[PDB]
Symmetry: C3
Subunit: 648 residues, 3 copies
C-alpha cells in the first residue's frame, strides 16, 4: 500500500455516507460521479452500529459493498474507526465511558481492522473523528478514575519557589495527557492487526480547542495530521468575507502541528446548512475554489469535503452534500472538479509545493488560554478567545499586506538554532509566559530575532502569578517595566508623538518606564511603547491591545503599516507582497522545484488593482476563474476570484 | 340522553350565546362584596360565571369537606339567575396560579378521586350549575417526567408499544416515543376525570379549556376528546398566548385561535372559557389593559366563528400575591370599567337578536389551512430548541398563521385545522382549497389522502419545506421523494440566504418576499415557473380534476418577516377557484390591517369587519348578494352601496338583504 | 483611642499581605502610605497564612506587617478571615458545619489573643462584606439553623380577616441569621479583647439592604462600615452619576449607623483588568469627589482597596493605588491632598454634621421582599427586581440636581415618636408594601405637621403581599382618596396636568383615583391622576403613576425636581442653600462644623456651569477647589469633574 509523503500528488475527495436503506444503484451512482469529478479519494465512517448483529458477531456486508464499488472506480478509502454509539450522536464519543466500554472498543477495532485491512484500496485509518471536546465527562467513572490516578503521579505545591501562591491547572494538564493517551492507545490497537496503513486523525474547532492538542506528542504515532475546518462551525471569530483568512490560519495551524509529517484537510464544508451549523451557509462555487487553493498553497496533501451524498434521517438529513437530490453535480462539485483536473494537468508542480516562509511566526500557547479561562464570559479582552483573536488579527493584517506568516503553538517553534537574523516572532496578548520560555525568547533576539509583543503578553506566568506585580521577568528583554494598565472604552486611539501613527486599541491602555530601551510617547506625554536593542536583534513592545483594536474597529490598515515598518528589509525584498494594505484582499506565495508562485484572492465588493512588489521575475497568470489580467506587476482581479501567478 | 339530562342544560349548536366572567372566590371576602359582584354581573347582561372550586378552601384539618364558602357564592349566583361553570381544582400550593396538570403519585390520584366524589356529589344539586370544567388549562410545555406517577405511566406506555430503530426500506428513524406518549397521557387523564364526574353526575355538560394553542397544539388530540366532552373551551389571553403577533393583529390571533378550537370541537359546540378582562400589573408575557374597542372585537370574532359564549378572566380580582388586583373588569370600587360597559353592549345585542345569534354558522370559503402534530415534533428535533424564524420552534405554526393573516386582509374566511380534523372521505372536492405552509412532516398515509383530494377536484397550495420529512424524521427528498407523483416534480437543492430575500420570477419582473431558504426543483409532469437566474423555483401540476401549486421557498414566513402580506394575498387569490370569489363576500383588493369574516343565520348572510389601521378606511365589499345594511357599529360607520366607511378600532356587522 | 462622632477623619488603604513578599517591599508600602498623609490601613488576617501542618498558629507573616505599621505610626483595622480556599476572593459568610464553627472559635481565640497586644491595633472587622444574595441552604449548618428557626416561629396561611397571605419565612430567617452570626463573632472577640472597636463592612447595599437589620447591629458594633466600589455596586447608575450613587450609599450607611459613627471601609483605589461588573480605573477627580461626599456625609474615614495589589490569579495587579514600581498613581497623589487638607483643618473636619434639609427618602425590607415574589425574578424597570430601590434613588438624584440634602433610610431607622414634624418631609417612592402599624406612624407624622409625598405603587400591598387596594384601602384615611384603576401603557408616557404647569415623565402604569376629602388634580384627558389631602397640621401629595422611575427611564429629573420643590415647606428653601433651578449633572450637599455652614458642589457635566446658590446666609468663600473655581456673589463657576467646598461667612 502507498504511504503518504510530502512528495505525494495532492487529491480532492469527499465523504461517502453509508447507512442501511441505500441501494447498490445509489451507491454506484455516487462513486461513478465522484470519479468523473476528478476525485481520487473518499472517507467512510465505519459505523459499529451498522456492523454489529443482535448475537454480537460482526456483519461487514454493508461496508464490503461500498469498499468494492470504491475499488471498481479506483477510489482509495480513508476508513474512520467509529464504534457503536447513539443514533443521535453526530460526531461520536471522544473517550471510553467505562472499563467495560473500553473492551467493546478493543473488540470493535480487532474485527474492523482485521477485515478491512485486506482491501487494496484502503489508504488510511482515521483513529477517531474530531478528537477533543470543550467539556470532558469528569462525571463518567472512566475519566474520574483516570484523573484521580493522574493527580497521585504528579506532585504540586500550593506555593512557588519565592513563597507566593500559585494555580497549577491540574485539570488542563491532565486533559492534554488524556488526549495523548487515548489517541496513542487507538494507534496501538490498530497496529496489533495492521502495520501497513497510514494512521490519521482530524482535530477541529482549532481556534477554541487548541488547548486540548499536543501535536508534537501526536507525531510519534501518526503518519499524517488531518483537520476539520467547517465555515459553519469553526470560523465564528470571522465574518464570511474573511473565511479566506480563517482557512489560511486554520491551515497554518495544522501544518505547524504536523511538523515533519505531511498534513491534509480531512473535513471541509461541501454543502448547505438547513437546520445545522452555528453560522449557517451554502458555500458558493467561488468559495470551494478559494478553500482548495489556500489549503494546497499551505502544503495540504488533500482536501476531503463533508459530504458527497447526504444523511437521510434526523440531524443533517439532506444537508452538507455536493450532489443535488437527483444525484447530479451542484456548482460546488463542478468547482471542486476544476481543481482535481488542474492537479492531473500540473502533477510535478502540485506534488512538490513548499510554503514560502516570510520568516514571520505568530505564536500562541496553551497556558495563555488556561490562565485566560481562570481570569474571565463569552464575547473581547475580558472574555474567552482574546488570546486567539489577537494573534488572528496580526495574521489577518499580514494577509491584507500579501505576506505569509506561520501560526504555531510555542512548543512547535525551534529555539535551538545559532542564528535568527531576519526571523520575526509576534506574541499578541499571550498573557502567560514562564521563565523557561523567556530564556528561549532572550536567546532568539540575542541571535538576531525581531520580537513584536502587544496587549498583556507576559502579564502572568504558567501558574497565573504576575511578575508585573512581584518583579517583571521580561524587564531584561524589553529593557523596560510596566507602570499602569487603565481600562478605557471598548475602542480608543493611541495617538503617537509627532503624528507618526493613530492606532486603534481595545479596552486597556498600558504605560511603561524605559531603562535600556528607547521610549515612544503619545500626544498626552505618556510612554506607551519602546524599542530595545538586545544583542544582534530587537524588541518592539506596546502593552495596549492594538491587534484586538484593529479587530474591534474592523480596520487592520494601521496595524499593517506599523508591522511592515518593524520587519527586517530582507523579508520585504525576497517575498512578494502588496505595495500597501488592501482591505479584504489576501496573497500567500509558495515554491515547487525552485519556481515561485503567488495565490491572490479578492474578497472585496469591487474589482481591485494590487501592485505586487518583492520577489523576482514576470507575473504569468497560471490559474484565474474570472479572467484576471496583469499590466507589469499590477494584477486586476474581480470580486470572489482566485488567481495563481507563476513567476518566470 | 334526555332522561339522563333531566333539568340540566345540554349546550348545543342552537343554544343562545352568553357573555360571562370568572367570579373569584377565596376566604376573607364578605357576603356584601360577593353580592355586589353578582348584582353588577346581572346588570351587565351577563348570564354566566365560572368559579374555581379550590379544594384548599374546602378541606378541613380532619380531612372532611366544608362547602360553606362556595355554597354562599352558588346561592348568590342563583338569586341573580346566573348559571355556573364549576372548575374542578384539587388542593395545591397557594403559589400555583394555573394548577397541576397530572397526578404527582398514586397516593395523590386518590386525593383527587376523593376531591371529585365530595365536590360533584354536593354541587350537582344546585339547579344553576351549567357545566363541570374537568381541569383548568390542560397541558404544560414542560411535563413532570421526574415525578413517579408520570415516570411509571411512560414506562408502562413504552412496554405496550413496539418500535424498530429502522423503517421498511432499512433506513434509520426517530419514533417520537415521548411526543406520542404525551398525546395518549392527556387523552387518558381527561377521560379519567370525565369518568370520575360521571360516577356522581350524569346530568351536566363536561367542558375543558386548552390554552397557548399556537405552542401547545402538539399536546392536544381534540378528536379523541370529543368522545367524553359535551363542549370544547379555550383560553385565548392577549397577554399570554399571542406572542407570535403584534397587538394591532390580535384580531387575526383571536380569529385563528377560534378557528383552531372550532375545528377541534367538530360536531361539539365550543365557547371561549377564558378571555382577558383587565390589566396586567406584574403578570403576563406581553402585558396590556384591553381597550373597550378590543373587548367588542374579541366577542364578535368569537361569535362569528360559532362560539356559544365568551367568559372573561376575571369579573373581580385576586387579593394576595400572584395577580392581586390584576385582570378584573370592575374597578377597585366594584363599579364598571369601560371594558364591562363594552361587554354589556354585546350581552344586550344578544337578548335583542336571539334568533340570529342562536343559529350562527361560519360561511366556509372552502379554504382550509392545515397543521399537523408531527411537523411540530420533527421541527423540535431538528432546531434542537432555538427560540427566535425558520431555524427555531414555531415556524411550523407562524407559516400557516401568515397565510391566515393574508386571507383575513382580503376579507376571506379560512379554517385552521389539525390534518386529522379534515374529512378526506368525500367523493368531490371541486372548489375546495388546502394550504400546507411549511408542514415539514407528511407520511405515506396522508400523501395518499392528499392525492385523493386533488384527483377529485381539490386545489393544494404548498410552500416552504412542506413534505421534506416523514413522521419518522426520514427525508424522502434524499431517499426517493414521496410527493413526486402529486407535485409532478422533484426538489434539486435548498440554498440558505439572508433572513429576508426576493424570489425574482423570469416573467413580468414579479417579486415575492421569502425567508431563509431558496428551493429549486426539476419538473416532470408539472408546468415549470423559472426565476431571472434560469433556475426552476415553482410549478403547477394538473392532477385529475384538481391542481397543485408548489413553491418550496418560505413565501409565508417571507411576508411575516417583511410585515407585508399584500403579495401573498394577490398570489393566493390568483390560485383560488373562481366559485369562492363569486359566492363569498371579500375585499376588492388587499387592505393592510383590516379583517372581514362572514357567517349565516337561518339563510341570512352577515359580515364582520374590523379596522385595525391608524386611519378611516373605505372597503369595497364584492361577492355575495344584496344590499349591505349596518346591523352593529360602535363608531357610526356608514355604507353607500357596498362601500363601508369604518373608523380605526371600530367593529361593524353587516346584514346582507 | 476608641472612635467617636468627634474623632479626626482619616484617609487609609488596604495593605495586602501574603507569603512571597519581602521585608523591603512591605516597608516601601508603609513608608509611602505615611508620606501620602494616610494614618490607617486594613489587613486581611488570612488563617491560611498562619496555620501550620500541626494545627498551631504561626503569627510571623502578620507580626512583620503590624511591626512595620507601628514604625510608620499607622494604625490597623484587622479583618478576621479564617482558613478558606485560595480562590475565595471575598470569604465565606457563615460556618459550613458545627465542626467548622469550632475551627472559627479556635481561629478567633489565637488571632485576637495575640494581635490585641499591639498598641497600633485600631479595630477588629468581625467579617468582610457580610451578606450574600443566595444562602447555602444545601450546607448542614445553615439547613439546621433554618429548621430550628421555623420550629420557634408559628405562621398562619391566613390573616385576621380570613384572606390568604405570604409570610416570607426565608427572608425573615435571613435577617435573624445575619443578626445572630455577627453578634456571635462580636461575643467571641469580647472573650479575649474588650478594649478595641468592633467594625463590619456591608456591601452592594442597593441590592443587599434586605439582608441588613442595622438597628440590631448597633447593639454590638462600635462603628458601621461599608464597601462602595464603583465597579461592583453602582449598576443602577451611569458613571457620570457615581457622585449621586456615593452620596446615597453614604446616606444609607449613616442612617444604619444611627448613634454610632460610620466610615467607608472599602472604596475603589485602582484599575479593573479582568474583575468587576462595570469595570473602570477611577480618575484623580473621582477619588476627590468620593472622599468629600463621604466626609460631608459624616464619614470618619475612607479606606481604599487597595494600596498594593494581590500577585496571583483573581485580581492580580488590579485595584492598587501604587503603580507596578511601587510609586504614586495620580489616584494616591489625589488621596494625599485630602489627608493634608484634614491635618491643616482638624477642628472643622473633626466635627462635621450633615445639614438635614428635613427631607427623608424611606425604603423598607418588605417592599423588596414582595417585589421579589411579584416579578418572579426578572432582571431589567417597574416589572423587575430593583424598582423599589431605583424609584427612591431617582427622587434622591432629582434632589441632588437641585442642591438639597436628603436622608436615605430604612423605615425602622426613622424616628416616629416626636410630637412635632413641622417642615419635615417623607418621600415614599414605589414602597409597594406598607402594613397597618407603619400607616399609623405615617398618620401621626402628617397630623403633627409632616409633608408626605408618595408615587408609583406605594401601599398597593401589605407585609403579607395582601392588597388592601382590592379588599379595603388601608391608606384611604391619610390620602383622603381611593385608587380606581392602574392601566399599563408604554415604557415611557407623559402625565400632562390640567394647569399647563407640569408635564411629567411616567413609567409603565397610569393610576386613576377618586378623591373624598382630598383636592383632586386632573390631567388634560379629564382623568383624576393625583391629589393633595390636608391632614391635621401637615399635607399629603399622592400620584400613583411612577414619576420617579419615569424620570430615571427618560434620563431627565428636571420636572420631578420642579414639582417636588413646589411641594416643600417654605422653611426648607429659606434655611438650606440650594440651586436657583434644576442643573443636569450637578450636585450640592451642605454640612455644619461648630456653627459654621459649608457646601460641597461637584460638576459632572461636560461643560463649565455657573450655578446660582440661593438660601442659607452670608458670603460664599471657596475653601477647597481642585480646578480654580471662582464665585462672584453667590454664583459659582465650576469646571467639569471639579469638587468645590464653600465656607459661608
Ligand atoms: C464533521 O462535521 C460534519 C458536519 O456537521 C459531521 O456531519 C461529521 O460527523 C463530522 F463530525
Ligand atoms: C387563566 O389565566 C388567568 C389569568 O392569568 C389565571 O389567573 C387563571 O388561573 C387561568 F389559568
Ligand atoms: C472588597 O473588594 C475587593 C475587590 O474585588 C475584594 O478583593 C476584597 O476581597 C473585598 F471583597
Ligand atoms: Cl468519519
Ligand atoms: Cl377556574
Ligand atoms: Cl479584609
Amino acid at each position: 500500500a502507498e504511504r503518504i509523503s510530502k512528495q505525494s500528488t495532492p487529491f480532492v475527495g469527499a465523504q461517502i455516507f453509508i447507512e442501511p436503506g441505500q441501494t447498490q444503484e445509489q451507491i454506484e451512482q455516487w462513486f461513478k460521479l465522484l470519479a468523473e469529478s476528478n476525485m481520487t479519494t473518499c472517507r467512510i465512517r465505519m459505523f459499529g452500529k451498522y456492523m454489529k448483529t443482535p448475537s454480537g458477531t460482526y456483519d461487514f456486508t454493508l461496508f464490503d459493498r461500498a469498499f468494492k464499488l470504491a475499488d471498481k472506480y479506483h477510489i482509495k478509502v480513508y476508513a474512520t474507526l467509529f464504534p457503536d454509539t447513539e443514533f443521535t450522536d453526530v460526531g461520536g464519543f471522544k473517550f471510553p465511558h467505562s472499563r467495560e466500554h473500553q473492551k467493546e472498543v478493543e473488540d470493535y477495532i480487532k474485527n474492523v481492522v482485521s477485515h478491512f485491512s485486506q482491501y487494496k484500496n484502503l489508504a488510511a485509518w482515521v483513529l477517531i473523528n474530531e478528537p477533543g471536546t470543550p467539556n470532558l465527562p469528569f462525571n463518567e467513572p472512566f475519566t474520574k478514575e483516570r484523573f484521580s490516578d493522574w493527580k497521585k503521579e504528579h506532585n504540586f505545591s500550593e506555593y512557588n519557589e519565592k513563597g507566593y501562591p500559585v494555580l497549577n491547572f491540574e485539570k488542563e494538564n491532565f486533559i492534554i495527557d488524556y488526549h495523548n493517551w487515548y489517541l496513542n492507545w487507538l494507534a496501538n490497537q490498530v497496529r496489533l492487526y495492521d502495520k501497513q496503513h497510514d494512521l490519521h486523525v482530524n482535530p477541529h474547532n482549532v481556534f477554541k480547542l487548541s488547548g486540548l492538542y499536543d501535536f508534537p506528542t501526536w507525531r510519534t504515532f501518526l503518519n499524517s495530521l488531518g483537520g476539520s475546518a467547517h465555515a459553519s462551525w469553526h470560523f465564528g471569530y470571522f465574518p464570511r468575507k474573511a473565511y479566506t483568512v480563517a482557512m489560511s490560519a486554520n491551515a497554518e495551524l495544522i501544518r505547524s502541528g504536523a511538523g515533519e509529517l505531511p498534513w491534509l484537510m480531512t473535513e471541509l464544508q461541501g454543502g448547505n446548512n438547513l437546520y445545522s451549523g452555528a453560522n449557517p451557509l451554502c458555500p458558493t462555487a467561488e468559495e470551494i475554489i478559494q478553500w482548495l487553493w489556500i489549503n494546497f498553497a499551505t502544503e495540504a496533501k488533500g482536501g476531503i469535503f463533508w459530504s458527497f451524498n447526504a444523511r437521510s434521517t434526523a440531524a443533517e438529513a439532506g444537508e452538507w452534500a455536493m450532489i443535488n437530490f437527483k444525484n447530479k453535480s451542484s456548482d460546488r462539485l463542478i468547482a471542486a472538479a476544476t481543481i482535481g483536473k488542474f492537479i492531473t494537468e500540473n502533477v510535478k508542480m502540485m506534488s512538490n509545493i513548499k510554503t514560502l516562509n516570510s520568516g514571520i511566526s505568530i505564536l500562541y500557547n496553551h497556558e495563555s488560554m488556561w490562565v485566560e479561562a481562570a481570569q474571565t464570559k463569552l464575547n473581547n479582552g475580558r472574555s474567552i478567545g482574546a488570546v486567539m483573536c489577537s494573534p488572528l488579527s496580526y495574521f489577518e493584517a499580514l494577509s491584507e499586506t500579501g505576506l505569509q506568516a506561520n501560526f504555531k503553538e510555542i512548543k512547535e517553534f525551534d529555539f535551538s538554532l545559532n542564528d535568527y537574523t531576519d526571523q520575526v516572532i509576534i506574541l499578541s496578548h499571550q498573557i502567560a509566559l514562564d521563565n523557561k520560555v523567556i530564556k528561549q525568547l532572550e536567546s532568539f533576539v540575542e541571535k538576531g530575532g525581531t520580537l513584536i509583543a502587544d496587549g498583556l503578553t507576559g502579564y502572568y506566568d504558567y501558574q497565573a502569578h504576575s511578575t508585573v506585580v512581584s518583579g517583571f521577568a521580561l524587564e531584561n528583554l524589553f529593557g523596560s517595566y510596566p507602570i499602569e494598565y487603565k481600562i478605557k472604552e471598548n475602542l480608543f486611539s493611541l495617538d503617537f508623538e509627532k503624528d507618526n501613527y493613530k492606532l486603534p486599541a481595545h479596552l486597556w491602555k498600558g504605560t511603561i518606564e524605559t531603562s535600556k530601551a528607547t521610549p515612544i510617547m503619545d500626544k498626552e506625554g505618556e510612554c506607551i511603547a519602546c524599542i530595545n536593542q538586545y544583542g544582534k536583534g530587537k524588541v518592539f513592545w506596546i502593552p495596549s491591545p492594538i491587534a484586538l483594536g484593529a479587530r474591534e474597529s474592523k480596520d487592520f490598515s494601521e496595524l499593517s503599516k506599523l508591522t511592515v515598518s518593524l520587519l527586517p528589509n530582507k523579508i520585504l525584498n525576497d517575498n512578494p507582497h502588496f505595495d500597501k494594505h488592501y482591505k479584504d484582499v489576501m496573497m500567500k506565495s509558495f515554491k515547487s522545484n525552485g519556481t515561485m508562485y503567488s495565490l491572490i484572492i479578492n474578497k472585496s465588493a469591487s474589482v481591485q488593482t494590487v501592485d505586487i512588489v518583492g520577489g523576482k521575475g514576470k507575473a504569468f497568470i497560471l490559474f484565474a476563474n474570472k479572467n484576471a489580467h496583469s499590466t507589469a506587476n499590477k494584477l486586476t482581479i474581480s470580486p470572489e476570484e482566485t488567481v495563481i501567478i507563476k513567476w518566470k
